[PDB]
Amino acid sequence: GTVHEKLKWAFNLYDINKDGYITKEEMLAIMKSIYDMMGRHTYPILREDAPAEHVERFFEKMDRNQDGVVTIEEFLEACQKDENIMSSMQLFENVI
C-alpha cells in the first residue's frame, strides 16, 4: 500500500471539494464526521474543550505560506516533518 499512497488517501477524505486546498470549514466537517465510535474504554488523545483550539495549532503547522488554507503540497511536506501530526492523521483512516 506504501506510505505515499496512504497520504493522498487521507487528503482525499479531508478535502471535500477536492481542490487541493483544505480550509477551516472543511476541517470542521471532518471533526464532526469522524468522531462516532472512537474507542470502547478510555482514549484521551483529543481533549476537545473548545471549538477553536486544536484547529489553530494544526493550521499554523500545516499552512506553510500561511495563505489561509492548507494545500496538498504543504500537507505532504509537513506530514514528513512531524511524527505526532502524522500519527493523528493515520488514526482517521484507521478509524474506518
25 binds Ca ion (CB under 5 A): no
Tally of CA atoms within 13 A in the half-sphere of 69 that contains its CB: 11
12 binds Ca ion (CB under 5 A): no
Binder to Ca ion among 6, 9, 12, 19 (CB under 5 A)?
19
80 binds Ca ion (CB under 5 A): no
Q: How many residues bind Ca ion (CB under 5 A)?
A: 9
> How far apart, in whole angstroms, are the C-alpha atoms of residue 43 and residue 85?
17
Q: Which backbone phi and psi does 58 adopt, to 5 degrees?
A: -65, -35
Binding residues for Ca ion, rule: CB under 5 A, are: 15, 17, 19, 21, 26, 63, 65, 67, 71
